[PDB]
Structure formats: C-alpha cells, structure tokens
C-alpha cells in the first residue's frame, strides 16, 4: 500500500521538514506507507506555487501538505477547491470557509481578545505584521468599537530592514504622544525578536510596560533578554511541554543528530514545526480510517494536466476530505479535532506570563469556556 | 495588421464591456485592428482566472485587458510578471511595484488623506470594505498615528446580506458610544 502525497516546503523550513521526517518515522505502519514528494519553492511566489501544485497533481497525489503566504493562499484554496484536492497546512487559518483545506493552526483571535479583557485594557498599541493577514487586526478593531477601546494600530511590517532604526525611533515617538505603556506584538517569531531587541535598547522594557506576544509560540523566542527588564510580558503557548506526550517527544527530539535533522537538537520546538508533526499523524489516521471503512480511492499518476478544461474533479477526493476532517487524535498541540470546513475545534491554548524564574502558565483558553485561570 | 488581445470581463460588467466596445469603435484605424477575445469568468475565483490567462496566452495574445479581485490579483501580477505579458486593468492599484501591469485607476489614498485635513477631522468613523484591499485602511491608520486621529475602523464587508439589519442597528450603536458624527464610507 503506497500512498503518494505532496509536500510544499518553503525554502528555510528546516525544523518544519525535520519534524515532518520524524513524523513519517513515528507514524509508519506495515498496513501502508506514505510517499512524500518534496518541492522546495518560494511560498510567496504565486506562480511557483501554481506549478508545484499542478506538478504534484499530475504525479497523481491523494493529498498535499504545505504552506502558503498572504499572497499565495488564494491560489491554494482555489485550486484545491476546484480539483477536490485536500490540502493540509500549519499556516495561518483561512479567512472564511474554504473546502478541501485542513488547518493545523487554531484561531488565536479569540484567545487574544479574552486576554485583553482579563488585564482590563482600554488603551493599547497594536503593532501588527501583514504577513499572516489582517484577520486579527480587524478582530481587535471591530471589538474596539463594542468594548470601546482606543487602539493605536501600526503596521510594523513594511519597515525596510537595511536602515530600520530611524523608523523604530519614530515609531516609539508616536507611542509616546499618548504615553502608550501597553503594546501588543502581532508578528512572527523573527519580527518579534527584532522589536524586543529595539525595546531593550531604548529601555522601554522596564517596569511600567506590558507586552503581549500575539502568537502560538510564546516560548519559541528568546525571552531571557526582556525577562529581567521589569516590564510584564504575556503570550500564548500551544505546545504544552508539561504533557507526558510532548515531554516524551522532546526526549527523543533533543537527542536527534543536528546534522541529519537541521535545528532539531533543542529542548523546545516552534509551534509551526510541532503542527507539521501533528499533520503527519492526522494524514495517517485519515488514510487508515479509509482502509478500515472499505473505501477504494486508489488511482495512478495520470490525473492529467490541472489546467484541463473542462476541469473534472475526481470523486475519490470527496472521501479523502471526509476522512481527514473526521480524524481525532492526541498530538503535541493538544486535542486535535475538526469541523466540516477544516478549522480546528475543541482545542486549548495556554495563557502564559513571563516572571523572574521564567515563563509560567496562568491559565488556558477554550473555544467554549473562554479564559480559565489555574490557581 | 491584426493584433490579438485578451479580455477578462467579470460576469456582470455590462457597462464596462459596453464602454469597451465603444472604445474599439472610436479608436479603430486602418493601420491596424484590435481583435478582442472575450472571456466571461468569475473574477473572484483564482483557479478560473488562471485558466482564462493561460487560454488567452496559448491563443497567442500581445496584451491582456481585464479585472482582478483582492483574491485573484496575486495570480495576475505573478503570471504577467513571469511570462512578460502586459496586463491593463481599471481595477484597484496593486499594493507594490508589480511589472507588466498597467493600472487605469489612480491612487485615491492621497486625495482622501488631504480631504480629511481640509475639514480638520480629528475623530471619525471609517467603514471599509475588504474588496479593494486594506491599502487605504492602512493609510488612514498609519496617518492616525502621526496626525493623531481617533479612527473607529469597522469592516462593513463581512455583513451577511440575508439578515443584514440587526447588524446595522448594532453598527450605529457603537458609533453612538462616542457620538460619531463624521463617517468615511470606503466601499463600492
């Protein structure tokens, strides 16, 4: 039983691919084996993504695992919907209801808004990055109307990096007109460290300031720098290192050879990589529930050109979707469940605060219970 | 002299196509004639747009005139840049510097910001629609930091139209907490 699948990994996704490999090994069974066809392309380039998709489609794959950007996301959601091809991705959730798309990343929009009310914020600065879509930006802006907030949204994304200093100085100059002491950083693990470094330089990391890292990887970045500054730092963690499940994973992950497995010789793991590992498990349980359900879907590498007109969707794809979406197992990112669309449900996001001794979970966030503190 | 060109018109662009026809007549010369190959597809659908582009490309066109949405725009800008195909469009300007794309619509971002200062606005509501990109939204938000404005941005786009009334009532309910009397409608 050889199930061919596609793999679209953006150049630089070392740990993500390393986690993708480990998953292939941990979830390999005799009943059937998964054959990944890896394609390293610039995820941002919409054209390239189109080729990589049609290429993996002509090779006759049953499902595709990859990533997309705020620019190429529409290409994937569209093609996968037309050709009835299933697409599993750890990337940011789609802004809507796009069929044939499985999203590993839970919606943070809810957990963020809940945290703001917890600290009882009425006036705060919102530094955002247009990389993961302004989905969360619209969230805080719309809620700012109801909850009556004075949000100071600033696009910290279009900042040219070959001279990005007179921009940060002019950034916190506007954040001083209203004496902003409460900032929300909605950026990637990289853009966050850049800001954190600047914050320490200008000395806005002392007692009185309060930062909120708006991502699922609070412990993914370096916090030792703004840890003793005095300013309170909060965030979100999706990979609970307190779970015996995750704890066991790290035991083997931290030991792996960094030569064969790039950026895999650490005690921690980026949430993007952790979702990749959990993605493999979902695809395995899905293709397994099809064998035990006596459902024939097999084909050959002659699906034809994806640009075929009229484009005819192979009916076997409808079943592959109902399989992945029906999957429900336990992974690094807590309980994994899906709805009819592909968005994760019944999940848990731990709320984190940075103390003197280090990060510490002060509670969690459920889609049904909102925020709940753990004494 | 027969110059074949592509025409991507979204279903419903009646007046747009009518104006497209009148132009063909008013600017028709003996030196050369333009041969439009019209393709009516759902501009929103990225997949369909890809086919309509490759179809007009296989037919061997010299240039393509059409429209794009906030979703399919990336497809056009990308392909036209790779295949060195020229794309003329009246749609909203691209957020950046994408080669092989001719944009008929001038940037309103500048004219808007200037008008706000003219009326000397410091606190206003900004009802926007995500259809033409949040390019202008970012404009007013970024300027709100410098010029020190209290902007109340509200996405009036995702409003489901088969019950869109308890939403508007709840919309101007928030625009009454601060007694907003100055609204900017950024919509179609």
UniProtKB/Swiss-Prot annotation, chain B:
<comment type="function">
    <text>Ionotropic glutamate receptor that functions as a ligand-gated cation channel, gated by L-glutamate and glutamatergic agonists such as alpha-amino-3-hydroxy-5-methyl-4-isoxazolepropionic acid (AMPA), quisqualic acid, and kainic acid. L-glutamate acts as an excitatory neurotransmitter at many synapses in the central nervous system and plays an important role in fast excitatory synaptic transmission.</text>
</comment>
<comment type="similarity">
    <text>Belongs to the glutamate-gated ion channel (TC 1.A.10.1) family. GRIA2 subfamily.</text>
</comment>
<protein>
    <recommendedName>
        <fullName>Glutamate receptor 2</fullName>
    </recommendedName>
</protein>
<comment type="subunit">
    <text>Homotetramer or heterotetramer of pore-forming glutamate receptor subunits. Tetramers may be formed by the dimerization of dimers. May interact with MPP4. Forms a ternary complex with GRIP1 and CSPG4. Interacts with ATAD1 in an ATP-dependent manner. ATAD1-catalyzed ATP hydrolysis disrupts binding to ATAD1 and to GRIP1 and leads to AMPAR complex disassembly. Interacts with GRIP2. Interacts with GRIP1. Interacts with NSF via its C-terminus. Interacts with CACNG2, PICK1 and GRIP2. Interacts with GRIA1 and SYNDIG1. Part of a complex containing GRIA2, NSF and NAPA and/or NAPB.</text>
</comment>
């Amino acid at each position: 039983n050889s199930i061919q699948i596609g793999g679209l990994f953006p150049r630089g996704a070392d740990q993500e691919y390393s986690a993708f490999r480990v998953g292939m090994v941990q979830f390999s069974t005799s009943e059937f084996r998964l054959t990944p066809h890896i394609d390293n392309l610039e995820v941002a380039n919409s054209f390239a993504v189109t080729n990589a998709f049609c290429s993996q489609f002509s090779r006759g794959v049953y499902a595709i695992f990859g990533f997309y950007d705020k620019k190429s996301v529409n290409t994937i959601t569209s093609f996968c919907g037309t050709l009835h091809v299933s697409f599993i991705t750890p990337s940011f959730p789609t802004d809507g209801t796009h069929p044939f798309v499985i999203q590993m990343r839970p919606d943070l929009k809810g957990a963020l808004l809940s945290l703001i009310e917890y600290y009882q914020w009425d006036k705060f600065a919102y530094l955002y990055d247009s990389d993961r879509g302004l989905s969360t930006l619209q969230a805080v802006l719309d809620s700012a109307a109801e909850k009556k907030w004075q949000v100071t949204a600033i696009n910290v994304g279009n900042i040219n990096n070959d001279k990005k200093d007179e921009t940060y100085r002019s950034l916190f100059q506007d954040l001083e007109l209203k004496k902003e002491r409460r900032v929300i950083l909605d950026c990637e693990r990289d853009k966050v460290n850049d800001i954190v470094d600047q914050v320490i330089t200008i000395g806005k990391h002392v007692k009185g300031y309060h930062y909120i890292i708006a991502n699922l990887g609070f412990t993914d970045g370096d916090l030792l720098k703004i840890q003793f500054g005095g300013a309170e730092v909060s965030g979100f963690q999706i990979v609970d290192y307190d779970d015996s499940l995750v704890s066991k994973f790290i035991e083997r992950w931290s030991t792996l050879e960094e030569k064969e497995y790039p950026g895999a010789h650490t005690a921690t793991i980026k949430y993007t990589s952790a979702l990749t590992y959990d993605a493999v498990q979902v695809m395995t349980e899905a293709f397994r529930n099809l064998r035990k359900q006596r459902i024939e879907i097999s084909r050959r590498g002659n699906a034809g050109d994806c640009l075929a007109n009229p484009a005819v969707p192979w009916g076997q794809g409808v079943e592959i979707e109902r399989a992945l979406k029906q999957v429900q197992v336990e992974g690094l990112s807590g309980n994994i469940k899906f709805d009819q669309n592909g968005k994760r449900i019944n999940y848990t996001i731990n709320i984190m605060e940075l103390k003197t001794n280090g990060p510490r979970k002060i509670g969690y966030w459920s889609e049904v219970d909102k925020m709940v503190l753990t004494e």
